[PDB]
Design a protein around this ligand. Structure first.
Ligand SMILES: Nc1ncnc2c1ncn2[C@@H]1O[C@H](COP(=O)(O)OP(=O)(O)OP(=O)(O)O)[C@@H](O)[C@H]1O
Ligand SMILES: [Mg+2]
Lengths: 464, 17, 110
């Protein structure tokens, strides 16, 4: 009745097998009950006192774990490194030969037997490269309908009907570059398109990496971090599912490879990324999306057509876009003043729409009550730049938050559960009482661009 | 504003059989 | 409570990273970020923008009475008292301590 266990090594044409047991390799014969053809390398085999294989089960689930270094060209062996940097050339079991194993993978091995059984997932490597689930939708973004259409055309359509593209032999876009004034909603568009692609498939994966997080004190770490990020992206996309990689605040890292900063390591970081996008090895289902409020500071090598070929310019919202944003951030469920509710006879939607219209009319006006800045150009002409030329979406959010805070103060002072239009009207002028980083030093680059649009160089900036 | 290169210092370790 | 001390020494720089971390921790409303700085002028107004660090509290010193209150907190009634000084207050330890605190505070602010 008692029976031992052993590790199968290989099969022979003589209907004989090799079994590792008790630290020794032996030549055995399979029992007539079992079929020698069904045997697989590394499979546990049940032995007996007569040293005959009678049954083969699954693979061993316990033992040491080693880091994979390389796969030998023969395709049946792998070089791995032990815990104490001891290097072993171990056999690969049948399950090892998802995606093919890469260097750095952890394998369950037993040194005495010398076989690699199972690839053991590691939580640390998964945590190193974050993959969150975006929740922002196209509804949350207003006033950028044409930009949403463009990003749908450059991302959604190639994967909706990719068979049509293959029939037309069209290559799906490989890079999208969002640029514009700060606070205009660069990250929201990327999050929305990622969420839409995630819902569209019926599976995708999204990688978000920030700018400063790719900076290290030593030399040679940012490049290997980028290499690991792109290796993860390739691993995820090898199954055929599209993968989106988003670089946030590309202005800070990998600037112009020329003069740029007088003391920076940038000259050795941008080419690596270039080699990760265009090179002898070409990624297949990876889309790189970059967002930077300073498009002129980005490396022209990155901006070359073929890498980040799609270029979208976000612009500051106008009056209609401001109304759209206010409608997005003001819902029917929001409490309103009882007087307005009585005036609208319970038509809450009409009340909030009218309040939004009044607010956006107040914000966009040439009256000297909404003066923001005084600009003197090279010709010497003084022009009053009002809020109309600096109505960013984040500014609208701050206005709404301040108005809601004023409403909280009013309801805690009086007790009536409502929101007054005068609250938002006062918040409009109280928004610029505190700095919103819109004003800057003598000659900012944004104001230089605005002057280039105007045609006369801006020389004097005065707070009003 | 400068980069560095690391030199390792091996720690003592010994096992039996 | 995450407290930052002597933040006037600092503030293209580390400010965007701090702002990003503050925005990330904004979801955790239980965590309270408290910053201290003796020079409000040197502090970059970007952190003072509406939103994250909206509440600002100004503190000062010692209104003399607080120093007395502080002396009462430090020089409690359990400290030894000289018999000669007790002779001036018929052995009332609390009254003697209060009078001594008043005297020392008055002399210090003289
Ligand atoms: N349609 C819209 N257009 C612009 N901004 C919007 C819109 N809807 C919401 N916002 C607000 O704009 C803010 C900024 O959005 P987003 O993160 O996409 O840009 P950003 O990266 O913060 O801009 P910056 O590059 O200046 O940091 C968000 O907090 C959001 O509340
Ligand atoms: Mg952003």
């Amino acid at each position: 009745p008692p029976s031992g266990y052993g590790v199968l090594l290989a099969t022979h044409d003589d209907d004989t097998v090799d079994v590792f047991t008790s630290g020794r390799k032996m030549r055995l014969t399979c029992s007539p009950n079992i079929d020698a053809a069904s045997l697989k390398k590394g499979q546990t085999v049940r032995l007996n006192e007569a040293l005959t294989v009678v049954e083969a089960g699954t693979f061993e689930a316990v033992g040491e774990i080693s880091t994979l270094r390389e796969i030998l060209a023969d395709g049946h062996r792998a070089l791995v490194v032990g815990h104490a940097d001891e290097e072993r050339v171990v056999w690969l079991a049948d399950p090892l030969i998802p995606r093919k194993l890469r260097p750095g993978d952890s394998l369950l091995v037993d040194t005495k037997a010398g076989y690699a059984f199972e690839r053991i997932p590691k939580a640390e490597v998964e945590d190193l490269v974050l993959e969150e689930v975006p929740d922002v939708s196209y509804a949350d973004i207003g006033g950028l309908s044409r930009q949403i259409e463009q990003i749908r055309d450059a991302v959604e359509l190639p994967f909706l009907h990719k068979e049509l593209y293959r029939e037309y032999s069209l290559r799906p876009p490989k890079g999208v570059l969002l640029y514009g004034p700060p606070g205009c909603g660069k990250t929201l568009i990327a999050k929305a398109v990622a969420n839409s692609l995630a819902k569209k498939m019926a599976k995708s994966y999204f990688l978000n990496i920030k700018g400063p997080e790719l900076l290290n004190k030593f030399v040679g770490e940012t490049e290997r971090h980028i290499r690991l990020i792109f290796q993860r992206a390739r691993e995820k996309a090898s199954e055929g599912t599209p993968v989106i990689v988003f670089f946030d605040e590309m202005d800070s890292i990998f600037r112009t490879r020329g003069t740029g900063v007088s003391s920076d390591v940038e000259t050795t970081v941008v080419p690596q990324l270039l080699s990760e996008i265009d090179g002898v090895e070409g990624l297949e289902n990876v889309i790189v999306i970059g967002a930077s409020n300073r498009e002129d500071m980005i490396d022209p090598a990155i901006l070359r057509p073929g890498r980040l070929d799609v270029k979208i310019k976000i612009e500051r919202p106008d009056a209609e876009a401001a109304q759209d944003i206010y409608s997005k951030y003001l819902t029917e469920f929001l409490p309103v003043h009882a007087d307005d509710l009585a005036e609208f006879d319970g038509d809450r939607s009409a009340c909030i729409k009218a309040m939004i219209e009044k607010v956006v009319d107040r914000m966009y006006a040439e009256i000297d009550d909404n003066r923001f800045l005084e600009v003197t150009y090279a010709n010497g002409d003084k022009e009053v730049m009002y809020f109309k030329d600096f109505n960013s979406g984040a500014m609208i959010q701050n206005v709404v938050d301040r108005a809601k805070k004023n409403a909280i103060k009013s309801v805690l002072e009086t007790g009536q559960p409502g929101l007054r239009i005068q609250h938002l009207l006062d918040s409009i002028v109280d928004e610029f009482a505190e700095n919103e980083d819109l004003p800057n030093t003598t000659n900012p680059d944004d104001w230089a661009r605005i002057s280039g649009k105007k045609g006369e160089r801006i020389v004097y900036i005065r707070t009003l | 504003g400068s980069m560095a290169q690391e030199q390792t210092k091996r720690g003592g370790g010994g096992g039996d059989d």
